[PDB]
Design a protein around this ligand. Structure first.
Ligand SMILES: CC(=O)N1CCN(c2ccc3c(NCCN)nc(C4(c5ccc(Cl)cc5)CCCC4)nc3c2)CC1
Ligand SMILES: CC(=O)N1CCN(c2ccc3c(NCCN)nc(C4(c5ccc(Cl)cc5)CCCC4)nc3c2)CC1
Ligand SMILES: [Mg+2]
Length: 300
């Protein structure tokens, strides 16, 4: 992890970056801010190239579509809470998801959005904006406090609140047992495994394949080739994470590195070629009057 670049938000006594993701154009990082702006930055110069007010509360998450034409945002305390934006020619709002705290695109064919409202998953069509499906069963709920619903790589299974759902049938196929209060899980990019906090489960057998005690309380992000997994641990204003991230080999779950950047982490992401890790670090403590975050770019 050799540091390659650092920048603060332009035109701010205090820098308010809260989350990031690389755009479909190399060199250009998309960042959300604590005032609910989306911003486009040159990741090398730190030059702000564009700006849009998406929400009147902080941005917690953003996801650009692979084809460069669409963007998902989530905010703290807005109605609507999440939204879908168009970025062809003009920046505009396409749809809004009135109480979803988190959203993702479908993975194989990016024609759907999955949104999370507490313990409930909503799937929407991108064209119509219609809610196609509500996935929720109160008898199978884990009530994870950081529940985030997600599609698998082929868009035909969903993980919501520790329940594996078959999208076509809208049937719960398996409830994974609850071993922590917060982390709900992700799909491995290989389509065969699910990572739920410290537990790695096989999707064909439901056997326990690995225990990874360093993944405890980590939000997991994969690189684009799916060879490496990055974990930032929940913190025990207030960042959602602590000041350390961990890397693991995605094939054998062996630890590669533990990096303490001595600054609470708000988000991290890789470019599509997996050359870079961009990390949003706060220079201020949780007690500061105001956030003062930087974006740090490291070469892996
Ligand atoms: C009140 C105020 O202004 N703030 C400033 C901004 N702050 C931020 C900054 C970054 C966040 C983040 N980044 C990682 C994903 N983009 N993820 C998230 C969420 C999350 C958290 C833990 C896990 Cl296990 C999984 C998901 C909550 C729903 C979106 C994802 N919440 C965040 C909140 C809140 C306080
Ligand atoms: C490849 C390369 O060299 N570049 C050089 C610099 N570049 C630029 C320069 C200006 C842009 C602009 N106008 C507003 C600038 N003040 N709007 C846009 C739009 C946008 C995107 C995000 C936000 Cl949040 C707000 C507005 C409008 C349609 C979506 C893009 N994208 C821009 C890209 C990136 C590519
Ligand atoms: Mg620089």
């Amino acid at each position: 992890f050799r540091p390659i670049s650092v920048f603060r938000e332009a035109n701010e006594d205090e820098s308010g970056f809260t989350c990031c993701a690389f755009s479909a154009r190399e060199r250009f990082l998309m960042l959300g801010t604590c005032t609910g702006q989306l911003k486009l930055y040159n990741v090398f110069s730190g030059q702000e190239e564009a700006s849009y007010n998406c929400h009147n509360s902080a941005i917690t998450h953003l996801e650009p579509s692979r084809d460069g034409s669409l963007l998902l945002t989530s905010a703290t305390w807005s109605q609507p809470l999440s939204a879908l934006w168009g970025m062809k020619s003009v920046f505009d709002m396409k749809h809004s998801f009135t109480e979803d705290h988190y959203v993702e695109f479908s993975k194989h064919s990016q024609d759907r959005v999955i949104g999370t409202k507490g313990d409930i998953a909503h799937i929407y069509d991108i064209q119509t904006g219609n809610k196609l499906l509500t996935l929720f069963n109160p008898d199978l709920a884990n009530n994870y406090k950081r529940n985030c619903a997600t599609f698998n790589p082929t868009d035909d299974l969903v993980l919501n609140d520790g329940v594996l759902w078959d999208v076509r049938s809208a049937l719960a196929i398996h409830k994974f047992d609850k071993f922590n209060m917060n982390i709900s899980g992700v799909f491995h990019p290989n389509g065969l495994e699910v990572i739920i906090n410290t537990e790695i489960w096989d999707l064909r057998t439901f056997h326990l394949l690995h225990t990874v005690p360093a993944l405890d309380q980590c939000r997991v992000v994969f690189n684009h080739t799916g060879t490496v997994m990055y974990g930032a641990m929940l913190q025990a204003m207030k960042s959602p994470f602590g000041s350390s991230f961990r890397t693991f080999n995605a094939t054998d779950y062996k630890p590669i590195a533990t990096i303490d950047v001595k600054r609470n982490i708000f988000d991290l992401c890789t470019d599509t070629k997996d050359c870079y890790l961009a990390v949003i670090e706060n220079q201020g403590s949780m007690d500061a009057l105001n956030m003062d975050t930087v974006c740090r770019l490291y070469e892996v």
